[PDB]
Design a protein around this ligand. Structure first.
Ligand SMILES: Cc1cc2nc3c(=O)[nH]c(=O)nc-3n(C[C@H](O)[C@H](O)[C@H](O)COP(=O)(O)O)c2cc1C
Ligand SMILES: COCCOC(=O)/C(=N\O)C(C)=O
Length: 367
């Protein structure tokens, strides 16, 4: 089974290639990591396994979900430390995903009820609704398009958050540059309608992600930095006229950052276009084209099964395979995939609820 061949992710020696995908679960009450998070990641940690946390706020304006953690306060750092300690006790590697939602937010999630920030003044269309703290769905508002000064301040938020993650003991961080959130709002020409140096050409639309990655690489070192993108995704009106070219433009800039820094990033993480909340062959081809173009470790994500994961690694389509929903409902997903044991179903109704146990840590282990 190729999923259990060891793999060297730069400075981290992994014993297998089953990765816990980053997953927002909304148990971090008032944006403070809670003890429930400690039990949840502990259940899923394995010796030599790689975990990526739920997306984590880099600033008070970053959030667009209720009770998601931050890592921009010392209190948050203090509580994350306890969670990282118990994961490390199991011998796992864990990265903190740094997450800014941009225009995918709401007045209720913003300080003083201010407008969410974005590359653009265009709101997400009414085809998408935002989950509210009371469990209803609200309207995405019109965002405020930020200037280049404010852009440089968001980059500094990323840099400070990456340092706080290292202070909490994280092995590294992942830049959430995917799924129509803030970075993807700069990347996608369906969203970025800017007329300054951050829009109007493919090179300009890649500026924001390049400067974010550069800042965090300089702060904590390239081999502690992973980057997630989804050039072809149907989420929150994040379309591009040429998804493969956008992906390859990002990859080229990551390659160049690596050469200038003298070290490879931890990995590039790409979401399969089939992942939803046009050809099957052209979608597998886009993934392999990006993998072949990038000088380093490739993590694929989105709709993988045990068989699809084995095949991705055996065929050289990816080095690591991250699992989301199946990891929600199978705390010992790694052992189950090793033994080819039956997997348990997941309940989407408790994906984003606040209960510290139900649908969170009460999915059982193999008997
Ligand atoms: C409940 C839930 C929360 C998620 N939260 C995040 C997130 O915060 N950041 C992110 O990059 N991806 C997030 N994802 C996407 C996953 O990281 C992963 O790519 C996806 O679940 C893989 O597809 P799979 O569930 O079939 O394994 C989330 C997915 C789910 C189902
Ligand atoms: C169909 O693609 C959906 C991608 O969006 C996500 O998976 C996500 N965060 O990135 C959350 C919070 O669910």
């Amino acid at each position: 089974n190729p999923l259990f061949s060891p793999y060297k992710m730069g400075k981290f020696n992994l014993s297998h290639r089953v990765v816990l995908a980053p997953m927002t679960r909304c148990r971090a009450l008032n944006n403070i990591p809670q003890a429930a998070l400690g039990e949840y990641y502990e259940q899923r940690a394995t010796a030599g396994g790689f975990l990526i946390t739920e997306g984590t706020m880099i600033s008070p304006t970053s959030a667009g979900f209720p009770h998601v953690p931050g890592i921009f306060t010392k209190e948050q750092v203090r509580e994350w430390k306890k969670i990282v300690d118990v994961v490390h006790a199991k011998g796992a590697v864990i990265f903190c995903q740094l997450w800014h939602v941009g225009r995918a937010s709401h007045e209720v999630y913003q300080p003083a009820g201010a407008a969410p920030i974005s590359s653009t003044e265009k709101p997400i269309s009414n085809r998408w609704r935002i989950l509210m703290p009371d469990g209803t769905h609200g309207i995405y508002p019109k965002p405020r398009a930020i200037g280049t000064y404010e852009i440089s301040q968001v980059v500094e938020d990323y840099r400070r958050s990456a340092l706080n993650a290292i202070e909490a003991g994280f092995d590294g961080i992942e830049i959430h540059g995917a799924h129509g959130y803030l970075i993807d709002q700069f990347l996608k020409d369906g969203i970025n309608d800017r007329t300054d140096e951050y829009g109007g050409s493919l090179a300009n639309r890649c500026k924001f992600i390049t400067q974010v990655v550069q800042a965090v690489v300089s702060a904590i070192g390239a081999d502690r930095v992973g980057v997630r993108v989804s050039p072809a995704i149907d989420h929150l009106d994040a379309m591009d006229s040429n998804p493969l070219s956008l992906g390859l433009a990002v990859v080229e800039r990551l390659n160049k950052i690596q050469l200038h820094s003298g070290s490879k990033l931890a990995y590039l993480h790409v979401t399969q276009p089939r992942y939803v909340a046009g050809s099957e062959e052209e979608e597998a081809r886009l993934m392999r084209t990006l993998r072949n173009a990038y000088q380093g470790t490739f993590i694929c994500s989105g709709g993988y099964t045990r068989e699809l994961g084995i095949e991705a690694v055996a065929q050289g389509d990816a080095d690591l395979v991250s699992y989301g929903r199946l990891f929600i409902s199978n705390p010992d997903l790694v052992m189950r995939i090793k033994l080819n044991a039956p997997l348990n179903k997941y309940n989407r109704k408790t994906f984003y609820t606040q209960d510290p146990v139900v649908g969170y840590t009460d999915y059982p282990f193999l008997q």
